[PDB]
């Protein structure tokens, strides 16, 4: 063991290094305390001909452009064209980059969002990618908007509102800005839940290509399909879509990353109306007389918002009816009251 | 309550240290310390001048 | 001049009181708060600023988009303010 006696000096040098890094590692808190302003970063690869080529283009908030190479600590998610980065008074170095900005269905919604995050072990053991796009289509009456948003609130994760008129803006070019923004919060921030609705109305493919806004909504929408079919790593936040009609369905939605789990929900018959309406009345005071037969039959061509309005109208006259519990005939009274 | 006529003696040491310290004088606030010896009331002589490490506070 | 007489004679302590309350950075308003130490602020000059909260203002009294006083030297929040149009 005479040859292994030199290891003690190596360990003394290592512990001496750990004892001497406290100063230069301690000044990080007083030098890199807080960036007082915010500056935008745009990536631009340079070439010097070590003497290696590496630089970046900076843009301050005060509309002043300066020069600085790619510097800082070990970068993993950095080097992207983002904002809200670290900057000192005048050195203008990069130190800290930060991103700027219920009963009848519980299986398909909860699984499709948990398995691409928790079941990675079975993904590595089987080599199978999970489905991404789910299409809650079918005739109206199910209430996919209020029930799908309510179940998205029951997912206990982050929820981001995104509708039709949200992406469609008065100016041009903003659609891709809100797509890269929904991918900023969703893709860049924590995994959130985004539910859009009425995709069939904007998925119109006309023959006369002279006047159709829905084809610019197919430029932003098919640009999202470019950012899903073109971008293989779709393991992050998915795109959940739903339509109220099967009149004009986009044929280019046939992909695992795209809308694959197209679950057909038919007209809300006594069973389905008893399901979504048992959800709508699973907590309120329901008297032991609501057979749901006549009132579930009279709910024809009534969406979940209009059926919720029927529940409100049932919640209107029961005050003056004298009974503190909602009765059977008050549902059909609300139906015949709205229409 | 008394005052005299003081005059600061400046040699080439502090001058050149302020020239190199001025070359390394980044816009960040810097710190320095001057030394010397007090021989009487109305004279002061500086000999030793060094620099201090910069900090985010200034 | 009669109104400026008593206040002019009472202007002596304004020199010893001129050192405090000097903080004025155009009353820049914040945008949001991702984490409790670091707060994102946006000035009216279209310049986004970030600074840590001072010890004189409690973190529970901070509201989203609230105009409060902020230093121009230490960049910290010295004292907030309640604010009037017709």
Distance in angstroms (rounded) separating the CA atoms of residues A199 and A320: 42
Read off the tokens for A104: 């009848």
Distance in angstroms (rounded) separating the CA atoms of residues C31 and C49: 10
Distance in angstroms (rounded) separating the CA atoms of residues A180 and A182: 6
Q: Which of A84, A49, A42 is nearest to A67 (CA)?
A: A42
Q: Tell me the backbone φ, ψ of residue A160, rounded to 5 degrees.
A: -120, 125
Q: Which of A31, A34, A35 best probes binding to B when mutated, by most B CB atoms within 10 angstroms? A: A31
Q: Element (H or E) spanning C16, and its range?
A: helix C13-16
Which DSSP symbol is given to A213? Answer: G
Give the per-residue SS3 of A151-204.
Answer: HHHHCCCEEEECCHHHHCCCCCCHHHHHHHHHHHHHHHCCCEEEECCCCCCCCC
Q: Tell me the backbone φ, ψ of residue A186, rounded to 5 degrees.
A: -75, -55
Read off the tokens for A289: 């007389």
Task: Give the one of A27, A30, A90 whose C-beta lies nearest to B27's C-beta.
Answer: A90
Read off the tokens for B5: 């006529």
Read off the tokens for A226: 């470019």
Cβ-in-10-Å burial (0-12, 13-18, 19+) of A22 comes to exposed
Residue with tokens 């800005």: A177
Contact C50 A38 (CB under 8 A): yes
Task: Give the one of B28, B55, B57 whose C-beta lies nearest to A90's C-beta.
Answer: B28
Query: Do the beta carbons of residue A96 and residue A85 sit within 8 Å?
Result: yes
Distance in angstroms (rounded) separating the CA atoms of residues B49 and A190: 54
Q: Which residues pair with B36 in a beta bridge?
A: B46
Between strands A133-137 and A259-264, the pairing is: parallel
Q: Tell me the backbone φ, ψ of residue A17, rounded to 5 degrees.
A: -65, -45
Residue A23, classed as helix, strand or coil, is helix
Q: Which of C73, C36, C66 is nearest to C52 (CA)?
A: C36
Read off the tokens for A180: 């890269």
- List B residues 11-50 in contact with A (Cβ-Cβ < 8 A): 26-28
Q: CB A4: neighbour CB atoms within 10 A? A: 7
Residue with tokens 């709910």: A299
The per-residue b/e assignment along A185-209, b for 16 or more CB within 10 angstroms, e otherwise, is bbbbeeebbbbbbbbbebbeeeeee
Distance in angstroms (rounded) separating the CA atoms of residues C33 and C38: 7
Query: Do the beta carbons of residue A275 and residue A141 sit within 8 Å?
Result: no
Distance in angstroms (rounded) separating the CA atoms of residues C73 and C45: 18
Distance in angstroms (rounded) separating the CA atoms of residues A224 and A10: 56
Among chain C residues, the shortest Cα distance to A88 is held by C50
Q: Which of A120, A116, A191, A109 is nearest to A157 (CA)?
A: A191
Between strands A192-195 and A158-161, the pairing is: parallel
Which DSSP symbol is given to C55? Answer: S
Distance of CA A178 to the CA centre of its chain: 12
Distance in angstroms (rounded) separating the CA atoms of residues A125 and A128: 9
Q: Which of A34, A86, A88, A89 best probes binding to B when mutated, by most B CB atoms within 10 angstroms? A: A89
Q: Element (H or E) spanning B43, and its range?
A: strand B43-51
For this PDB entry, the determination method is: cryo-EM
Q: What is the DSSP string of A289-337?
A: T---HHHHHH--S--HHHHHHHHHHHHHHTTTTS-SSB-SHHHHHHHHH
Distance in angstroms (rounded) separating the CA atoms of residues A164 and A176: 14
Distance in angstroms (rounded) separating the CA atoms of residues C37 and A87: 17
Distance in angstroms (rounded) separating the CA atoms of residues A147 and C68: 41
Read off the tokens for C12: 């002596």
Q: Tell me the backbone φ, ψ of residue C23, rounded to 5 degrees.
A: -70, 125
Task: Give the one of B26, B28, B56 whose C-beta lies nearest to A30's C-beta.
Answer: B56
Q: Which residues contact A279 (CB under 8 A, 6 or more apart)?
A: A102, A103, A104, A147
Q: How many CA atoms, within 13 angstroms, populate the side-chain half-sphere of residue A161?
A: 5
Residue with tokens 């057909």: A264
Longest dimension (CA), chain C: 54
**Does residue C73 sit at the A interface (CB-CB below 8 Å)?**
no
Residue with tokens 């960040």: B28
A138 is in an annotated binding site: yes
Residues of C in contact with A36 (CB under 8 A): 49-51, 75
Read off the tokens for C76: 């910290």
Q: Which of A202, A164, A166, A162 is nearest to A185 (CA)?
A: A162
A141 is in an annotated binding site: yes
């Amino acid at each position: 063991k005479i040859m292994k006696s030199e290891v003690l000096r190596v360990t003394h040098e290592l512990q001496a290094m750990k004892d001497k890094i406290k100063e230069n590692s301690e000044k990080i808190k007083v030098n890199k305390t807080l960036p007082y302003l915010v500056s935008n970063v745009i990536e631009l690869l340079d070439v010097d001909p070590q003497r290696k080529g590496k630089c970046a283009v900076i843009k301050t908030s005060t509309r002043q452009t300066y020069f600085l190479p790619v510097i800082g600590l070990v970068d993993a998610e950095k080097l992207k064209p983002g904002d809200l980065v670290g900057v000192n008074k005048d050195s203008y170095l990069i130190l800290e980059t930060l991103p700027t900005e219920l009963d009848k269905q519980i299986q398909e919604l909860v699984e499709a969002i948990v398995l691409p995050m928790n079941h990675k072990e079975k993904f590595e053991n089987l080599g199978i990618q999970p489905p991404k796009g789910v299409l809650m289509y079918g005739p109206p009456g199910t209430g996919k908007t209020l029930l799908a948003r309510a179940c998205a609130a029951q997912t206990k994760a982050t929820f981001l509102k995104l509708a039709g008129p949200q992406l469609v803006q008065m100016f041009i070019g903003d659609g891709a800005k809100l797509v890269r923004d929904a991918f900023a919060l969703a893709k860049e921030k924590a995994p959130s839940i985004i539910f859009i609705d009425e995709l069939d109305a904007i998925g119109t493919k006309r023959f006369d290509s002279e006047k159709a806004g829905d084809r610019e909504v197919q430029r932003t929408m098919l640009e999202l399909l470019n950012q899903l079919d073109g971008f293989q790593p779709n393991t992050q936040v998915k795109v959940i879509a739903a339509t109220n009609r099967v009149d004009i369905l986009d044929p280019a939605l046939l992909r695992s990353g795209r809308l694959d789990r197209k679950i057909e929900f038919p007209m809300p018959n006594e069973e389905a109306r008893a399901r979504i309406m048992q959800i709508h009345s699973r907590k309120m005071n329901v008297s032991p007389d609501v057979n749901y037969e006549e009132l579930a039959r009279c709910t024809d061509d009534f969406n979940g918002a209009q059926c919720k309005a029927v529940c409100v109208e049932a919640g209107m006259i029961a005050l003056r009816r004298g009974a503190t519990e909602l009765t059977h005939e008050d549902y059909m009274e609300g139906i015949l009251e709205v229409q | 309550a008394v005052d005299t006529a003081e005059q600061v003696y400046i040699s080439s040491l502090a001058l050149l240290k302020m020239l190199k310290h001025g070359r390394a004088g980044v816009p960040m606030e810097v710190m320095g310390l001057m030394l010397g010896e007090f021989v009487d009331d109305y004279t002061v002589r500086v000999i030793d001048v060094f620099a201090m490490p910069q900090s985010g506070t200034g | 001049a009669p109104p400026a007489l008593w206040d002019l004679a009472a202007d002596k302590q304004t020199l010893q009181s001129e050192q405090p309350l000097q903080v004025a950075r155009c009353t820049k308003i914040i945008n949001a708060d991702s984490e409790d130490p670091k707060y994102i602020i946006n000035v009216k000059q279209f310049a986004k600023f970030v600074v840590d909260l001072s010890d004189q203002v409690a973190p529970t009294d901070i509201e989203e988009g609230m105009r409060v006083g902020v230093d121009r030297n230490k960049y910290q929040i010295h004292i907030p303010l309640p604010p009037d149009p017709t």
